[PDB]
Design a protein around this ligand. Structure first.
Ligand SMILES: NS(=O)(=O)c1ccccc1OC(F)F
Ligand SMILES: NS(=O)(=O)c1ccccc1OC(F)F
Lengths: 202, 202
């Protein structure tokens, strides 16, 4: 029994499971299925934990999943995450977004700006305006910097600016980017083989 | 986009991942690769969490993985497990062993008896003789019952009885049972496809 050939087979299958789970995470994010997103992310996170070396293509996959994970927790009051990260989930997503090997196209910029604004807005929505300032000072260390600080200082959560740079607009733009990832990975081994089984059944 | 066909495909692929991960768990258990066993069990446990309905064949797979999991933690001093279970890991394994849909062949009996004896022995080995009695009273509520209670009372950890019903003998018997499971699942979709990729490479 060649343990090296078996270990190699287990790594091939791990790469197959990673792509399958990224597709599933993207679809659950797109469809708004929170519990399926949560359970799929737990599966992907455990599979990724098994992998010790990743290719350029696999690193992109895990960072997209990390990005979608933080975005989903944008309005959540996570303490431990902030205990270690010390930053808001959206701020973390911004870091990943600006670190992924992706074309900095117009959508990239649009998504980036939305996340930035929403990082502050979400805090205002939950009533933590001090954090909103802390998030503002961390992101914006541009004649809109004095407007944004004025909005935060006046607890103007429903300013027209926040209606143009809204949570729904952030989500729609991220969801359209997800659709390109979904179209790219739709043809991966595990999902392609699985759909052929269901198509051959009925 | 038929969400029902996609959900069905995701369940087919989940069943494929479950069998693949059971094979990997069995091989890591057989080879004595603790960290790979730990990481594979975390992967299988997350995949299983995603599944809400299991077939007779899938229930057998998850119970075999549960069995191997408790056995691996036989000598571990788990508190929370005992906090909820209130029993030793080996005792838990015994329950699963006697509940799995499997032929009660000679090996079954041999494995069962070994686990029983070792459940007490492991406690004696760690110095908890009170628990050994608690484990003894829980399992044995047979002229060897007065011998076993005498062995525990006298802290006779190295009695000839424990050398016939030893940890290594329990492991060897469980490992030979694992080899039948391994031979049965060796032909599952994910592993069979993965090995064909590595064979076609070199
Ligand atoms: N970091 S990772 O690649 O294990 C991963 C993958 C999918 C979802 C979450 C996630 O990490 C988690 F911390 F966000
Ligand atoms: N119960 S389960 O089917 O999710 C499972 C599968 C493999 C290993 C452990 C495990 O449970 C764990 F509690 F032991």
């Amino acid at each position: 029994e060649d343990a090296g050939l078996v270990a190699e087979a287990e790594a091939v299958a791990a790469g197959w499971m990673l792509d399958f789970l990224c597709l599933s995470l993207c679809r659950a994010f797109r469809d708004g299925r929170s519990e399926d997103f949560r359970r799929t992310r737990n599966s992907a996170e455990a599979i990724i934990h098994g992998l010790s070396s990743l290719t350029a293509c696999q690193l992109r996959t895990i960072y997209i999943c990390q990005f979608l994970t933080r975005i989903a927790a944008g309005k959540t009051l996570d303490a431990q995450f902030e205990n270690d990260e010390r930053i808001t989930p959206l701020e973390s997503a911004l870091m990943i977004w600006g670190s992924i090997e992706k074309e900095h196209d117009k959508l990239h910029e649009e998504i980036q700006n939305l996340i930035k604004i929403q990082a502050i807005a979400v805090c205002m929505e939950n009533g933590n305006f001090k954090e909103a300032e802390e998030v503002f000072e961390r992101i914006f260390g541009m004649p809109f910097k004095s407007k944004l600080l004025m909005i935060i200082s006046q607890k103007d959560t429903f300013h027209s600016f926040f209606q143009h740079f809204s949570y729904n607009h952030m989500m729609e733009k991220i969801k359209s980017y997800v659709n390109y990832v979904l179209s790219e990975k739709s043809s991966t081994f595990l999902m392609k083989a699985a759909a052929k089984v269901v198509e051959s059944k009925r």
